C-alpha cells in the first residue's frame, strides 16, 4: 500500500533547489488516485501510456504556473537548467496543479526558492543545493555577498494576487 | 475500463494545446467519444463529439478554432485546441457517449486548463437535510419524449451518469435515485439523502448533440 498520498498530500512541499525524492520500494500501488482525482491542472505521462500503467521515485517540489511546461523532457529554462532537470528520453509521469491557496500569501510567500545562478547546465536528475556565492566578477568572492558575488538563490514571492502564471504549483514526478 | 486523459497547464491567450484522453475498457474509434467543459463558476457545456464513422461536431463557441480526433493505433481520442481565449478557460473531460441507449456512461478525469431546445432546471439551489426526500426538475422548451438523463457531479470531482432514457437506472447507482416524466417536464427523485448525495445535478438531452441545462445544487 504504497504511500503515493504522503507526497501528494504533504503538507509541506520543497523548493526546487532542494526537491525530495522519496524512493518507494516494497509495496505495490495503484495509480489510480493520479487519474481519479480530476483536481490536477497537468498531468502527462512520457516513455508509457497512463492506462497501462497497473498491469520508482517520487519527486516533489513548488515552482510558479508558466514554468511547470518545463518539468518535462527537451524543455528548458531557469528551471529545467538550474533547479530540476529531467531526461529528454523521461519514462514517467508529471502532475501539476496549483497551489495558491497554499503557497500563497499576503504581501508574499518568500519561503520557497529556485537557483537563479549557475554556471552549467544541471544533469538529468541530478540537484544542487549549494550555497556558494557565485561569481559574475572578474575580481574573486571569498564567499562574500556583494557587487558580482551574489547568493545564488532566489526566492518566489509567491503572492495570491499574482497572475495565474506567476501562481505556486505543486509538482510531483514519477520516473520509473 | 478507464479513460485517463493527459496534458493542459496553463497558456496565454492565442496559444494552442493538445489533449489527450487514453480508454482501457472501450474502443475509441468504435464509440461516439465527447469533450464536456465545465467553466469556472458555470455548468457543464458539450464542446465537440466525434461519431464511430468519422464525423465530426462541435459547439459554435469553438468551431474552427478545436479539432477532434483519435488515432486507433495507441486507442486515444484528442481534442485539438488553437486559438484559445479567456472563454476556453474550463475542466475539459472526455467522455463515451452511448447517446439515447445510455448516456455519457464513462468519463476521464478532469483536465483544467488555464487560458491567462432550451433545456432549464429548477431550483437553482437547495439544502435539504441528511435522509430527507429530495425532488428536483428539469424542463424542456420542445418536447423531447423521454430522451433525457441526470448526471451527478461533486466539486472537483469529474460527472456521473445516474438516469437515463428519463426512467431508466444506470447500473451501479443507489436505489434512492429514481427519476420520472415525459414530453417537456422531468424530475429527478433522491428517497433519503446520504451525506454522500450532497453534488450538484444536471439533465442533458440525448437526442440533439449533447446539452446540459443549469444545474441544480444540493446542499446543506
Known amino acids: 500500500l504504497c504511500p503515493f498520498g504522503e507526497v501528494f498530500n504533504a503538507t509541506r512541499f520543497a523548493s526546487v533547489y532542494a526537491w525530495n525524492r522519496k524512493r518507494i520500494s516494497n509495496c505495490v500501488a495503484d495509480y489510480s488516485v493520479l487519474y481519479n482525482s480530476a483536481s490536477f491542472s497537468t498531468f502527462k505521462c512520457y516513455g508509457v501510456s497512463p492506462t497501462k500503467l497497473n498491469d520508482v521515485y517520487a519527486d516533489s517540489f513548488v515552482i510558479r504556473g508558466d514554468e511547470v511546461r518545463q518539468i518535462a523532457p527537451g524543455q528548458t529554462g531557469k528551471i529545467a537548467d538550474y533547479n530540476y532537470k529531467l531526461p529528454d528520453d523521461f519514462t514517467g509521469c508529471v502532475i501539476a496543479w496549483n497551489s495558491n491557496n497554499l503557497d500563497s500569501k499576503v504581501g508574499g510567500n518568500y519561503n520557497y526558492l529556485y537557483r537563479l545562478f549557475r554556471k552549467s547546465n544541471l544533469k538529468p536528475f541530478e540537484r544542487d543545493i549549494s550555497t556558494e556565492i557565485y561569481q559574475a566578477g572578474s575580481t574573486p568572492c571569498n564567499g562574500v555577498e556583494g557587487f558580482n558575488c551574489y547568493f545564488p538563490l532566489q526566492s518566489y514571492g509567491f503572492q495570491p494576487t499574482n497572475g495565474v502564471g506567476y501562481q505556486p504549483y505543486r509538482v510531483v514526478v514519477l520516473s520509473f | 475500463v478507464q479513460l485517463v486523459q493527459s496534458g493542459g497547464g496553463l497558456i496565454q491567450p492565442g496559444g494552442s494545446l493538445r489533449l489527450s484522453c487514453a480508454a482501457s475498457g472501450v474502443t475509441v474509434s468504435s464509440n461516439y467519444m465527447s469533450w464536456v467543459r465545465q467553466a469556472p463558476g458555470r455548468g457543464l457545456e458539450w464542446v465537440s463529439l466525434?461519431?464511430?464513422?468519422?464525423?465530426?461536431y462541435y459547439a459554435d463557441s469553438v468551431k474552427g478554432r478545436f479539432t477532434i480526433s483519435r488515432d486507433n493505433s495507441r486507442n486515444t481520442l484528442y481534442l485539438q485546441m488553437n486559438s484559445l481565449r479567456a472563454e476556453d478557460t474550463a475542466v475539459y473531460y472526455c467522455?463515451?457517449?452511448?447517446?439515447?441507449?445510455?448516456?455519457?456512461?464513462?468519463w476521464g478525469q478532469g483536465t483544467t486548463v488555464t487560458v491567462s431546445i432550451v433545456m432549464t432546471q429548477s431550483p437553482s439551489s437547495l439544502s435539504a437535510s441528511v435522509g430527507d426526500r429530495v425532488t428536483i426538475t428539469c424542463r424542456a422548451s420542445q418536447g423531447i419524449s423521454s430522451y433525457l438523463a441526470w448526471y451527478q457531479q461533486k466539486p472537483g470531482k469529474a460527472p456521473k451518469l445516474l438516469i437515463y432514457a428519463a426512467s431508466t437506472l444506470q447500473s451501479g447507482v443507489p436505489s434512492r435515485f429514481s427519476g420520472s416524466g415525459s414530453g417537456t417536464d422531468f424530475t429527478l427523485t433522491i428517497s433519503s439523502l446520504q451525506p454522500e448525495d450532497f453534488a450538484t445535478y444536471y439533465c442533458?438531452?440525448?437526442?440533439?448533440?449533447?446539452?446540459f441545462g443549469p444545474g441544480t445544487k444540493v446542499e446543506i
Open positions: 467522455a463515451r457517449d452511448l447517446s439515447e441507449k445510455g448516456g455519457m456512461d464513462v
Open positions: 466525434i461519431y464511430p464513422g468519422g464525423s465530426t
Open positions: 442533458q438531452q440525448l437526442n440533439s448533440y449533447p446539452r
